[PDB]
Design a binder for this molecule. Sequence first.
Ligand SMILES: O=P(O)(O)O[C@H]1[C@H](OP(=O)(O)O)[C@@H](OP(=O)(O)O)[C@H](OP(=O)(O)OP(=O)(O)O)[C@H](OP(=O)(O)OP(=O)(O)O)[C@@H]1OP(=O)(O)O
Ligand SMILES: O=P(O)(O)O[C@H]1[C@H](OP(=O)(O)O)[C@@H](OP(=O)(O)O)[C@H](OP(=O)(O)O)[C@@H](OP(=O)(O)O)[C@H]1OP(=O)(O)O
Length: 1773
Amino acid sequence: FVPQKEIVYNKLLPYAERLDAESDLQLAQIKCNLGRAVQLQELWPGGLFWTRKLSTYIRLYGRKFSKEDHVLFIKLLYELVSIPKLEISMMQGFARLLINLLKKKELLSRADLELPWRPLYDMVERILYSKTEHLGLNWFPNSVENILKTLVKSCRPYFPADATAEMLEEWRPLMCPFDVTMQKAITYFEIFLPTSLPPELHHKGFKLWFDELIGLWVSVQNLPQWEGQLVNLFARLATDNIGYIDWDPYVPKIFTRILRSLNLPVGSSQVLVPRFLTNAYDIGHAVIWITAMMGGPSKLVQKHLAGLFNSITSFYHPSNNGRWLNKLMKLLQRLPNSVVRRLHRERYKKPSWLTPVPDSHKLTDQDVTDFVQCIIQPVLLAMFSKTGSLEAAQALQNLALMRPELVIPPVLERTYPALETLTEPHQLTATLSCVIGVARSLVSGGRWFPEGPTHMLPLLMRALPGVDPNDFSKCMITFQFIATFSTLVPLVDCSSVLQERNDLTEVERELCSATAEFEDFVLQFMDRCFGLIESSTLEQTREETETEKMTHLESLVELGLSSTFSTILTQCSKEIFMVALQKVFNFSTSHIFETRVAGRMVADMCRAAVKCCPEESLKLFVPHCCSVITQLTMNDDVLNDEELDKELLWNLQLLSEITRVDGRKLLLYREQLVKILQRTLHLTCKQGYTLSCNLLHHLLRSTTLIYPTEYCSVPGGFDKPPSEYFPIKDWGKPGDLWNLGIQWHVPSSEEVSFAFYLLDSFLQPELVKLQHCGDGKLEMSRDDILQSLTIVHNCLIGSGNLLPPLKGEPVTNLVPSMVSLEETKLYTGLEYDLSRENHREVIATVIRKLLNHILDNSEDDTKSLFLIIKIIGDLLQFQGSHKHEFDSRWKSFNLVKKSMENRLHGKKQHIRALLIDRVMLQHELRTLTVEGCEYKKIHQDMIRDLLRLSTSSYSQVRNKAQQTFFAALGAYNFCCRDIIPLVLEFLRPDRQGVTQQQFKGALYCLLGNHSGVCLANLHDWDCIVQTWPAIVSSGLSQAMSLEKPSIVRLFDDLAEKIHRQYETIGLDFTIPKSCVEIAELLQQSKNPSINQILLSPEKIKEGIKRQQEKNADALRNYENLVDTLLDGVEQRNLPWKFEHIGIGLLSLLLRDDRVLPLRAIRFFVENLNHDAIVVRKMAISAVAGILKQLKRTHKKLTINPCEISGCPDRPDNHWLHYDSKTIPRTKKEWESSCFVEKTHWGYYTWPKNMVVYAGVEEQPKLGRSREDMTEAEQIIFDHFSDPKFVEQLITFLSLEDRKGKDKFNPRRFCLFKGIFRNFDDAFLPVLKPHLEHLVADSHESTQRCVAEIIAGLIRGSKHWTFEKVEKLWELLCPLLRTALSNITVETYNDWGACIATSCESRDPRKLHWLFELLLESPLSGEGGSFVDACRLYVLQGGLAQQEWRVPELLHRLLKYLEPKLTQVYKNVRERIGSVLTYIFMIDVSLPNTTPTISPHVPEFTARILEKLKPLMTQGIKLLKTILKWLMASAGRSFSTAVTEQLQLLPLFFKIAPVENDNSYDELKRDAKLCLSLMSQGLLYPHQVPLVLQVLKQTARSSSWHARYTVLTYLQTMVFYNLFIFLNNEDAVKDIRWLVISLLEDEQLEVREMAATTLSGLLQCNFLTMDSPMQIHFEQLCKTKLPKAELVKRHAGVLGLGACVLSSPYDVPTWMPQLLMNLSAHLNDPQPIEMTVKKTLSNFRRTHHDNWQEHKQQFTDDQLLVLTDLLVSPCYYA
Ligand SMILES: O=P(O)(O)O[C@H]1[C@H](OP(=O)(O)O)[C@@H](OP(=O)(O)O)[C@H](OP(=O)(O)OP(=O)(O)O)[C@H](OP(=O)(O)OP(=O)(O)O)[C@@H]1OP(=O)(O)O
Ligand SMILES: O=P(O)(O)O[C@H]1[C@H](OP(=O)(O)O)[C@@H](OP(=O)(O)O)[C@H](OP(=O)(O)O)[C@@H](OP(=O)(O)O)[C@H]1OP(=O)(O)O
C-alpha cells in the first residue's frame, strides 16, 4: 500500500473520490512499462513515453508514491542520465524529471538515498567542457548548461560522506592561479562540493576545504572570473551551515567587497575607471550570504549592515539616480525577502533531515527589529524613485511581516498627503503601490499595530477620485488598490452590533461605527465608474472606416473594472448588494451604449452584478432585455437588414454577456432565452448574429463546465447569516485550505439535457444546411455559409465538454513498440454517455464535405475558410477549457498570489479568493493534460485537410491554418512521421503542376516559425533523411520563384533554424547491464503496482535484436544522408543559394563517434579551393574536424614525481624544479626528459596519477607513406602533396574578407594544427615557397595567412621526433626573424596571437628556439621604435602563457629592461609597463605559499627608489615607465600593493596636478590617474598602519599639491576599503586626526578639500560626530582677529560647514544649532564669507525637497534667521 509522500490541491476538487483509483492505476502502469522499456532495450518509443507520463504524473498528483517507490524512480533515472555517451537531447529529457524527484529535499532522508558523483562528472565534462563541439563534432542543446547544474544541485546532498575528499583530490591539482584551468576547478567547487551535510560529518565536509579556500578568497584583491564563483559557493555554504562557521574573522573583508561591488562614484573625479570590474558579485547571491550571518550572539554582522546602508543612504535619494541604482534597488528587494525566509526556516518550518539552526544562532526579536530600523530609511527613499516603486513595495511588504508597528506609520504619513495634493502627482502612483504590499499587514490588527483598520476606510474613501478617465496609471493603481482592500474587509454595515455588546474593544468599536460608509463607498464607486465609462465611449471620427477593436489600454480598463468591481460586489452584504443592484440596472437600461468599447464595459459591470446573487439579479435583467429584443426585432421584417437599430443591437450584448451566471439558475428562463435565439440568431447583420452566437455560446458554457460560483472570503458568505456572527472579526482572515467551504457547479441532468436541447435545435439545423451545400444540393451564398459556421463554431467551442473526441486507430506506418503506448485518461467530472449522438463526429464529416466543396467551387471565400480553421482547431484539441486562457489565468494567479502573500508563516495565510481559483486552476489543468493521444484515422484526415489549407491560395488563410497545423502536430503521438512524406510532395522537382502558393506554403510548414514543432529539423534519422535532401533538391528544379524576396528570406530562415536547433543524434542506444534497477522496479514494487505479469523469458533477446537493428538503421540512415546531400550539392544546374544550404547541412553531420564517409572527405578537401568564400570558410571548419577524427591516439604513462627531482607547498616546490626551464634544455638527448605539456600541472599539488606521454617510438610512427596508411581516409594526403592544390589554397587564404574586421583566425589555426599533427611535416617540403614568399610581403593579408601556418607548425610539432624538431626550426628560426623584422600596424595583433598561440599547452623545454629568438633583442631597434614595441608585445604573450614554468627568462628580460627602461619612447613605455606586470605576476603572497624563483616586487622596487632618490632629469624619465607599469598592475596582479611600492606614493603626490586637465604634461596626467587606480584598489588589514604612515608623512609639510591629493586619495580609499578601516579602530582615529589637522593648512585650496573630505566621511558614517569634534570647532570659530589667525578662524567655519553639508536630506537635533552660529560668520572677512555663503546656499538647495517636514525641526525664532539671509552670488549684488 502507498503512504503518499506529498500530494496537492485535489482533495478539495469535487470529484475527489475518484482521484485514488485513477491515480494509482496510472502509477501502476508507470511501474510496469518504465521498467519494461529499460529492460527490453527500448528508449525511442517507450523510454520517453513513460518518462513523459511520470513527468505528467508528478505535475498532476504531486508525488503520491512511497519512499521505496521514490528511490526506484531516482535510481532508474540517475542510471539513465549516467549512461556513458548517450544522445544528449534525450539526456535532458531524463534530466528534468530527475530534477523534479529530487528538488524537494525533505521528502527523502540521507539514510534513505545515496548517489555517486563521478557519473555526474563524466556527464558534465562531456557536455560542458567538451574537447569536441568547437570543431563541429558535437552539437549540444542550448539549455544544457543550466539543466546539468540544477541536476547536480539536486543530487549533491546525497553524495556519500567519504566522497568530498574524493572530490577534493581531483580538481585540487587544477588550482594554479595563472592558467585557465583554475576556473575549471572553482566552477566544479561551486557545483559539486557537498555543503548540506548533517553536523556529525563536518570533518568530512567544509572543514576539509573551508580555511583552505576562504584563505584564498581573502588574499586575491584582483577580481578574477573565479572570485564570483566562490561568493556563490560561500553563500550556499553559509545558508546551510548556520551556526558552524565563525564568520567573525572574515566579516569586515566580506562587507567591504559587497560595498565595492556596488561600484559607487566617490571623489568628484572618482575614476580612472577600472574596466576589470565588469565581473563582480551577484548581490542576489550576496543577500543569501549576509542573511546567513545575522543570528550570532555577538551581533557583529548587524552593525555592518547598519554601516552599509548609512554609508549609501544618499544614493537611494530620488534625486541621486544613476547607473548604480539597478544593483541598489535589487539589494532592497532581496534582503527583507531573505530575512523573512530565514525566519520562516526557524520558526514555522517543520523539522526534517536537514539540520536546523542552533538555538544560539537564531534571529531574536531584537535582531529583526534592528534589521528593519537600518533599512527603513533607504526603503522610504526608494519609494519615490524615478525608476518606479516596484522594488520598494516588495521590500515594504516583507518588512511589514516582521515589524508592522515600525514600518506602516512611516508609509501612511506619506500616503494621506499623496491622495489630496493636486501637485507632485508621482506620489499617488507610488504611495498607493506601497499600501498594496502593506495591505495584508494593515487590515490585520496584531498585538503591536492595532490601529491598522482605522486607516482602512479613510484611505479607501479618499482613493475614489483616483478612478479618473485621464490618467490610466492612477486608474490602474486605484483599481488595484480598492480590489486588494475589498477582498480583505467585508463591506457590511455594523449598527445592530453597535448596540450593547461587550465584544467590541476600543479599536474594534471604532471600526464598526466607520462601517456606515460602506454603502457610501460602493455607491460612490459606481457613480465614479459610470463617469469612467460614459466619458470613454468610442467616437467614430473617420467616415470611411469603423474602429472595431478595443485597444490594449482600453481592454485593461475593462478587465481592471471587471476585476475591481466584481470583488467589491462579492465582498458585500445582501442589504448593500440590492441597493447597489438597482444602481446598475437603472444605469445600463436607461442608456444606449456603443457596443464596441462601452458595450463590453457596461455589460461586464452587469456581469459582476449577476455572478454574486443570480436570483435577485436575473429577476430584472433578462425580463427587461428579452421584452425589448422581441419588441425591436420581430415586429417589422428586421430579419433581413443591413444595419440593426442600435438599441436592439445593444440589448443583445446586454443579454449575451450577462447570461453566464451559474447555470442552475438559468433553468428558470428556458422559455425566454430559446425564444430570442430562434429569432435573432439567423439575422443578416454581421454583428447581429455574433451577439446572438455569443448568447448561445455562454449558455452552453454555463451548462457544461465545472466552476466555482462564489469567491468570497468566508465560506458561508457575507449575506446568508446576517447578525449571527460579528463581521468585523473576519478582516484578517487567513482563509484555511482545509474546510474551505468551496461551492461548485457540476452540470445536472436538467442542465445537460438543456445543453443538448440547444444543440439539437441550432447545431443540427445549421449542419443540414452545410451538408446540402457541400453536396451540391443547396448552393448557399458566400455570407450564408459564413453565418452558419459561426453557429457550428460557437456550439462546438462552448459545449465541447459534452463531446467525445474520436475513434478509428490508424496504425501500421507509425513507430512500433515493445511496451504499452496507451493514452492517459483523466476523469474531469462528467460521464458523456456516448450512445446517443456524438455531435463532434458529425461536424467532422460535414466539414470534410464542406471544405472539399469550398476549395473547388469558391476559392475566394476567405472568411468561410477562417471559420473552418477555427472549428478544426477545436474539433481536434478542445475539451472544456482553452489552452491559452488557462495560461493567462495561470499568470494572473501568480501575479496576485506573489503580490499579497505572508512569507513569514507559510501556506496558512493565502486568502480564500486566491485558493478557490487555484483549485479551479487544478481542474483546468486536468482538462488540458492530454499527454498521450493515439493518432487515429480521423486525425490522419483532419490534419491532411489542414495541410491543404496550409498550402492554399491565400496567405491570410495559410497563416491561420499552419498555426492549427503546428498545434495539431504536437498533440498526437507519431504524426510527424506520417506527414513529412505528404508535405514534401509539394517540393519535388518531378511534380508537374505545383503553384507558387502551393510551393512556399509547404515551406512554411517545414519552417515551424514557433516554439512547438520544427517539421524539417526533427530529432530522428528517418525524418532527417527526407527533409534535408528535399530542401537541397528544391531549387535545381521546382516552381521555386527565387526572384521573390520573401522566399529568399524563407530559405535563409529555414537554414538558419536548422543550424540553431540541430543537436547530434545517437547511434548506439545500448542500455548498460547496470539496469537491474529496472528489474527491481518492474518486480517487487507491488505497493500500488496492480500489474501481475512479471515475465520476460526471451523477449529481452527480441528487444536486444530490435535495438541492434535500430543501431544498424541509425548508422544506415546517417551514411545515406551523406550520400543524398552530396548527390544534391554536386547536382547540375543548381542555383548557388541551394548549395550553401547543402554544404550547410553537411557541416552538421561530421561526427565524433564515427568517421565521415569517403565521398564527403573528398568533398570538403576539394571545396577548400572553391570560388565562393562562404563555402571554403566552411570547408576549413570541416576538414579541421576530419583531422580530429583521423587522430591516431597517442599512448601515455604515469610519473611518480618523487622518482625524478631526487627527493619528495602551493608554488615552486623543491620537488618541482624539473618543470622550470633554465639551463638543462634538451639539445641532443631530447628523449628521457619528462615533458609536461600543459602548464598548470604540479603547481599546487600532484594528482593521484600524474600522466605524461610515452618514451621514444612507443607513440605511433610519424614518417609514413600511402602503403602503411588507411587507404580510404587519407585522400587528404593526395591533395596537400599536389602543388596546384597547395598554391591555390595559399592564394585563397591570403585574400581579404574585410579590411577592418580581419584577425588571426583560430579556426584556420585548427585546420593547420590538425595537418602537421596528423601527417608530421609530410607537407612542409611542398610548402617551401609558400612560407618564404608570404613572410616577405608588406600586405597584412599574407602576414595573417602565414601566421596560422607558423603556429600550426609549432603546436603540431608536439609528438615529433628529435630529428624533425631540429629540422623544423632550422628553417623556422630564420623565418620568424624575417617576420618579426617586417612587423606592421595591421600585423602585430596577428603575430601577437601567433607565437602567443603556439605557447599554449607546450612545455617551455620543447620550445626554446622561440625563447632564444624572442628574447634575443626586443628593444635593440634596427628599424624604428614602433617595431620595437610590437616586438616586445609578442614577447609578452608567449611568456605569459608559460606562466609560472619559467623564472629564468623573466629575469633575463628584467635584466634586459632595467638599463633600457629609462631611455625609450612612449609606445615602448606602454609595452614595458604591460610586460613588467607579467614579469612580476608570480609574486602573489597567497596564504600557504613559498617565495618563488620568479623575480620579486620587493627586490626590484627597492632598486627603483635607489634611482628615484634625487627626487625624494633622468629620474623623471624613469617615472614614465614606473607610472605606466603601476597603471597596468592595477587589477592585473594578485596583490595590488606591495609595501615597498607604498612609498612611491609621496613621489606621485607632488607630481599629480589639481585640476586634472588635458593641458598638463604626460608625466602629470599619468600620475593623477595612477593615484586613482591605487586608491580604488583593496588593501590587506595589516596595511592600514603602513599607508596611513605614508599619508600622514606626505601631508605633514611638503607642498600644497601633495596635501591636496592626500585628501583626494583618502576619500576614494577609505570608501572602497570602508570596513577594513572600521575594524582597525586605531586607524579611524588617525584619519580623523589627519583630516581635521589639514583644515589648518596655509593653502586655502587644501583646507576646503579637507572640509569636503570631512563632510563625506561624516556622511558615510566613517566618522561619528562626537562632542569633542564640535568643541574643537566651536572653540575655534570664536577666535580674535587682530590686524595666521584668519586661517585659524576659517577652519572652524569649514568645520561647522562640513557638518552642515554632511546631512543634505535630513535635519538632525544638532543641525539647527550649528546653522545659527554658522550664520553669525556671514559678515566675517572674505575667505570666511565665501564658505558660509557656499554652505548655506548648498543647504537651501538640497533642503527644498520636503522643507515642510524640515521646518518642524526649527524654532519659529530660527526660521526668521535662515529665511532672511544673504547667500547670493556676485551677480545678484
Ligand atoms: O504548482 P506550481 O504553481 O508550479 O507551484 C508550486 C511549486 O512548484 P511545483 O509544485 O514543485 O511544480 C512548489 O514550489 P517549489 O517546489 O519550486 O519550491 C510548491 O512549493 P512547496 O509546497 O513544495 O514548498 P512550501 O510549502 O512553500 O514550503 C508550491 O509553492 P508554495 O506556494 O510556496 O507552497 P504551498 O503549495 O503553498 O504549500 C507551489 O504550489 P502552488 O501551485 O500553490 O503555487
Ligand atoms: O596541444 P594542444 O593544442 O594544447 O591540444 C591538446 C591535444 O589535442 P589535439 O589532438 O587536438 O592536438 C591533446 O591530444 P593528445 O596529444 O593527447 O593526442 C589533448 O589530449 P586528449 O586527447 O587526451 O583530450 C589535449 O586535451 P586535454 O588538455 O583535455 O588533455 C589538447 O589540449 P586542449 O584541450 O587545451 O586543446
